[PDB]
Amino acid sequence: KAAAIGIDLGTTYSCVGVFQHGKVEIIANDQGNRTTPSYVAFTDTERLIGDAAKNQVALNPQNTVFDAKRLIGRKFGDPVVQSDMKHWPFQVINDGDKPKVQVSYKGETKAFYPEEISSMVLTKMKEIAEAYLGYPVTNAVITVPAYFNDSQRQATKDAGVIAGLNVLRIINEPTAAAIAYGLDRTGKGERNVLIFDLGGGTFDVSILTIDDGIFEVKATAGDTHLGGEDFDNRLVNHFVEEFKRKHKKDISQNKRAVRRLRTACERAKRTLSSSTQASLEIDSLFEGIDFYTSITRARFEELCSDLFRSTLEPVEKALRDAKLDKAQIHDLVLVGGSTRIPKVQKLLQDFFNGRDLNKSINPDEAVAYGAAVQAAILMGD
């Protein structure tokens, strides 16, 4: 009777969709948001997930966990884990060569495996879907990066089961995006699809060949220097510099000032996709000083011009590795919040010599949309 849900369990944000009433619907959370932060915070009295957790990250950096997807299914000694650890404000410890995030919760030290943390984010996505549907959800399709190995896939599935979900299938994020656009519904004959995913924890480019509904990953490329946070850092530095030649004060060492400015910038980036201007209005940013300002989109698209231009190098590389010419790609698919930035669309379109783009589905929702279609297919509804 009950519909199964599709969940994009993202590094920074997650999204949940469901097929019902003949169409896919992406579900907004209780704050009206279509995507939810993959954050979990522990306080003296409660466990916060999603928006509530992200909202108090500045007040509780040591016990606000995020990026659990970077740890999931990995070993403590993994060089990736060892390297990422120096950048997180929360503690990660070794337990049988498995990493655990250690925090203070209700006055005591507690540690959680990465799948436990992600299970909490999945529980929130599940609850968001149940609030909307009005009934219990017990089945889901969850997505993962095409480059996840068996251990990362297992741990992601485990996170879903811990959350009380029967995991129908774990499918690749770029595959889910292709399914969202109905690109696997043709018949015999290879179709080459390129998925350009920008705005999340990392920049991923995937080239898939689809033949009679069968997906094959032909190439994967990316740039870890082009995560959504790297574009935000550009905005942050811009405003730190602006604040400096206005008040002759450098707020870069004040960890709290920088946090709120970061928050403001992310917010700014988004509206700049729809607006030609974005306003920053921070009361008492530094030493009681208020910061009200704004940024224009081409100052921004300019501020990040080199970063945006850099996204084409992994595209060129992927084509080279897949042994395909630009003209041999049949469809271009946008995923990730930053692909709605006009400059980004122009760069990809121009690189492909005027090709139009599959962009009718909000890019930061396409993966969950495809997961929702697949879940319905597997349920038989």
Closest by CA to 207, choosing from 69, 341, 325, is 325
Binding-site positions for ATP read 10-13, 69, 200-202, 266-273, 337-340
Closer residue to Zn ion, CB minimum distance, 320 or 323? 320
User: Angle of helix 366-379 relative to helix 173-180, nearest 10 degrees?
Assistant: 80
197 flagged as catalytic: yes
Query: Is 156 in contact with 185 (CB distance < 8 Å)?
Result: no
Min dist CB 209 to Zn ion, Å, is 26
Verify binding: residue 225, Zn ion, rule CB under 5 A: yes
Binding-site positions read 10-13, 69, 200-202, 266-273, 337-340
Verify binding: residue 309, Zn ion, rule CB under 5 A: no
Residues in Cβ contact with 291 at an 8 Å cutoff, skipping those fewer than 6 apart:
239, 243, 261, 280, 281, 282, 285
Verify binding: residue 323, Zn ion, rule CB under 5 A: no
Query: Which segment (58-66, 91-99, 129-137, 221-229) binds Zn ion by CB under 5 A?
Result: 221-229
Closer residue to Zn ion, CB minimum distance, 184 or 223? 223
Min dist CB 224 to Zn ion, Å, is 6
Query: Which segment (136-144, 186-194, 218-226, 261-269) binds Zn ion by CB under 5 A?
Result: 218-226
Closer residue to Zn ion, CB minimum distance, 106 or 225? 225
State the DSSP code for 358. B
190 flagged as catalytic: no
Query: Is 60 in contact with 41 (CB distance < 8 Å)?
Result: yes
Q: How many helices (H) and strands (E) does the chain have?
A: 12, 18
Closer residue to Zn ion, CB minimum distance, 223 or 365? 223
Residues in Cβ contact with 216 at an 8 Å cutoff, skipping those fewer than 6 apart:
208, 209, 210
Token output for 62: 């040591």
Q: Which amino acid is at 243?
A: F
Verify binding: residue 223, Zn ion, rule CB under 5 A: yes
| CA 151 from centroid of its chain's CA atoms | 20
Of the residues 54, 67, 69, 364, only one is catalytic, namely: 69
Chain residues in the site for Zn ion (CB under 5 A): 223, 225
Catalytic residue numbers read 8, 69, 173, 197
